[PDB]
Amino acid sequence: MFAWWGRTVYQFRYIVIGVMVALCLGGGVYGISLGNHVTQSGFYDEGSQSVAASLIGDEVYGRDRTSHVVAILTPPDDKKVTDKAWQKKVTEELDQVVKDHEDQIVGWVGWLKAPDTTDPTVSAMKTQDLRHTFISIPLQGDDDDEILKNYQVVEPELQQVNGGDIRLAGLNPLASELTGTIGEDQKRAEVAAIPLVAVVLFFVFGTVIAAALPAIIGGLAIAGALGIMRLVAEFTPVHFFAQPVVTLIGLGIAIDYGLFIVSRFREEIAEGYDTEAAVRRTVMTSGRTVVFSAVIIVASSVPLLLFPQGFLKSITYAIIASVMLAAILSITVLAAALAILGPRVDALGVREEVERGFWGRLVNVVMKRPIAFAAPILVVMVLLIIPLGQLSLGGISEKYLPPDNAVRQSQEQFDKLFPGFRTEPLTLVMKREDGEPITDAQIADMRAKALTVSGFTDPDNDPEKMWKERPANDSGSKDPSVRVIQNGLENRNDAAKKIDELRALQPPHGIEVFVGGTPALEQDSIHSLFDKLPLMALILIVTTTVLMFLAFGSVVLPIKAALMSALTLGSTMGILTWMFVDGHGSGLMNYTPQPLMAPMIGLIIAVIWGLSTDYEVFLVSRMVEARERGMSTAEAIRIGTATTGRLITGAALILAVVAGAFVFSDLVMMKYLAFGLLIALLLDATIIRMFLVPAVMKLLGDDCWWAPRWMKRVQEKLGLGETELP
């Protein structure tokens, strides 16, 4: 197989170098148009019942724009707010803002337009102290992103009201700073880590071209990845955290892939055959190695397709495109580029034997007492997977930002004087058939059915006042064919129980019950994730194990690899749990202990499983190819793992630098992911490969291979069994 590829690839070097760059610069420049298009809202499971209830309710009554952006006004000099002067000034400023930006807002409404009101809806919104009062601004928008952009437009003067000492609250400021933190963090990463990423791999090489090549190809790969998944975005909206994660994954993985091939080609040109033969056997081995690692990681990541959450789909598409394009980038153009480079690789300039001796003696002292080198780490790793039991999960909120932040502080201050204007109630949608008003008793009978259960919010202290109709906006389409009511579950820890009891309620004659609302919206997501988790885990195990069995003929290695990766996964996620849901360190790292998001764990399990498995197979490719040189396993272990230690450690440190750069973020979730990758890589690099692979490898003796031939022949006739060089 791959001999044909080498024999045809040294033929075309200049042509390939031209065409690949000429066709990928299109995506490189096309990524800006991706930078234009952004979506933010999709986090909930699209196919559940709460989303359908919300959709039909939004159809019947429209959307309520009272909670988009909220400003807290405080008067200078501590003056009675009921005066005329300061109120006149603020109304002047606000109606000037209203007229100046017509399309963004509808206007302003609240207490401050009511001099002497009677109804305790806006007079009671004024604090008894009369030193803070909030007045809301509804925003005209077609959908979510249009509203967010309109609020971004109206930022300057709407924040520059009076002296500028009024604070802004609501969902829109939170979303705006959430999406601004992503850009700030991306700028910080691309300014800080990239120099370190380049110089670390430069020092281990002391070379110009050999150090520049991994970055040169990683940038092209990520540019193509954004181009491809933007082309996808025409058929499916892509979320905005797809911007930093594509960097976070692709940079490291593409640099790793290029680094392996560069190292092999250089170590083979320097010692063995000439340029062409060395590069063709270099592709012979490393091209299939990196291709197998890429197919393993895509097979491990595609199980995320099960979850219907949109941003998960976007992340999966971006990462699979990134890695499968980096694979073909590394195998195709790199071989020809190095072949035409020839002696120019290390000629640019600015230990070998001592380093190989240190590695060999470390391996031998592992062989001194391999079981004593594995039992303590085996015990401590389960000791580290213990703390996952106190795990708790929840949705996104305003506490996902550092407490020192201005918008978070303002939102927290909003509830200091306004107790119950920020409510998240549970909704009961109706299901009417005829389309004209059938009966007026249905609201009463559903009220009684809800009354069959106790433990709910009865602030009015009236048996009937509970469960009132939703405030219907005039712009909505009032179809008398579906009815919505609302009220709030008090303690959101009993939200699951209340939702279960309410969904179990009687659906009346011709009436079908629905349960919407933000608690149900954020609970159906976690329920769907926990229901689709088992098949996700089953495929993540089986597909990866079988696929990595096809790389090399042995069948024992997949078995050991499966539980070597799964236990590392458990250990790193347990360390993350003990660190975050308990906030151990927050005090110093400026975040808050809070439950993690539902989809983040589902993403992280798959991604770290893929990373651990691919790093392990990168290490063990030499381990398995060394034996069929006519040697036994005792020499093969050292032969495989001696020269590999120089390069994988540098690559691991590169990904560690990228993750550490992402650690300095503001959002808690990117901190979660970055620490997860740091801990998983640090474990699998420092301790796992260094005292666990040989520890079980020698203990398994020469039995390590024991490959049945009835499947070994199938392994052979795929053409990819060429693990021996002539």
The Cα–Cα gap between 696 and 256 comes to: 26
The 3-state secondary structure of 308-358, one letter per residue: CCHHHHHHHHHHHHHHHHHHHHHHHHHHHHHHHHCCHHHHCCCCCHHHHHH
Q: Residues 6 or more apart from 375 whose CB is under 8 A from it?
A: none
Would you state the structure tokens that stand for residue 221, as one six-digit string? 């790969």
The Cα–Cα gap between 405 and 109 comes to: 28
For residue 467, is it left (φ>0), alpha (ψ between -120 and 50) or beta?
left
Compute, in degrees rounded to 10, the torsion defined by CA atoms 527, 532, 534, 535: 170
Does 684 carry a binding-site annotation? no
| Burial grade of 155 (CB within 10 A; 0-12, 13-18, 19 or more) | middle
| Burial grade of 464 (CB within 10 A; 0-12, 13-18, 19 or more) | exposed
Closest to 544 in 3D by CA, of 625, 624, 614, 603: 614
Does 413 carry a binding-site annotation? no
Q: Is 431 helix (H, G, I), strand (E, B) or coil?
A: coil
Q: CA 428, 145, 180: angle at the middle one, nearest 5?
A: 115
The Cα–Cα gap between 666 and 591 comes to: 8
Beta bridge partners of 486: 427, 468
Q: Is 485 helix (H, G, I), strand (E, B) or coil?
A: strand
Q: Is 666 helix (H, G, I), strand (E, B) or coil?
A: coil
Measured CA distances, 219 to 147, 233, 368, 604 (Å): 34, 21, 45, 24
Residue 178: phi, psi to the nearest 5? -60, -45
Resolution number, Å: 2.9
The Cα–Cα gap between 78 and 624 comes to: 79
Closest to 564 in 3D by CA, of 703, 656, 694: 694
Q: Residues 6 or more apart from 566 whose CB is under 8 A from it?
A: 541, 609
Element holding 712 (H helix, E strand): helix 709-717
Q: Is 157 helix (H, G, I), strand (E, B) or coil?
A: helix
Q: Residues 6 or more apart from 693 whose CB is under 8 A from it?
A: 564, 616, 619, 620, 623, 641
Beta bridge partners of 133: 73
Does 44 carry a binding-site annotation? yes
The Cα–Cα gap between 465 and 459 comes to: 9
Measured CA distances, 74 to 130, 166, 654 (Å): 9, 7, 50
Does 43 carry a binding-site annotation? yes
Would you state the structure tokens that stand for residue 695, as one six-digit string? 């520890």
R_g of the chain computed on alpha carbons: 31
Measured CA distances, 393 to 154, 555, 566, 663, 680 (Å): 35, 38, 21, 21, 21
Compute, in degrees rounded to 10, the torsion defined by CA atoms 653, 656, 660, 663: 180
Closest to 559 in 3D by CA, of 459, 700, 430: 700
| Burial grade of 538 (CB within 10 A; 0-12, 13-18, 19 or more) | exposed
Specify whether the CB–CB gap between 452 and 467 falls below 8 A: no
The Cα–Cα gap between 342 and 346 comes to: 9
Residue 244: phi, psi to the nearest 5? -85, -30
Beta bridge partners of 487: 426
Does 586 carry a binding-site annotation? no
The Cα–Cα gap between 360 and 412 comes to: 59
Give me the helices (H) in 234-287, please. Answer: 242-271, 275-282
Q: Are strands 167-169 and 69-73 parallel, antiparallel or unpaired?
A: antiparallel
- Distance spanning both ends of the chain, measured CA to CA: 14
AA letter at 335 = A
Would you state the structure tokens that stand for residue 75, as one six-digit string? 């008067």
The Cα–Cα gap between 569 and 684 comes to: 10
Q: Are strands 167-169 and 484-487 parallel, antiparallel or unpaired?
A: unpaired
The Cα–Cα gap between 316 and 259 comes to: 24
Residue 533: phi, psi to the nearest 5? -60, -45
| Burial grade of 719 (CB within 10 A; 0-12, 13-18, 19 or more) | exposed
Q: Please state how this structure was obtained.
A: cryo-EM
Closest to 673 in 3D by CA, of 327, 256, 216, 319: 319
The Cα–Cα gap between 159 and 169 comes to: 11
Does 317 carry a binding-site annotation? no
Q: Residues 6 or more apart from 421 whose CB is under 8 A from it?
A: 125, 134
Specify whether the CB–CB gap between 135 and 112 falls below 8 A: yes
Would you state the structure tokens that stand for residue 91, as one six-digit string? 């109304």
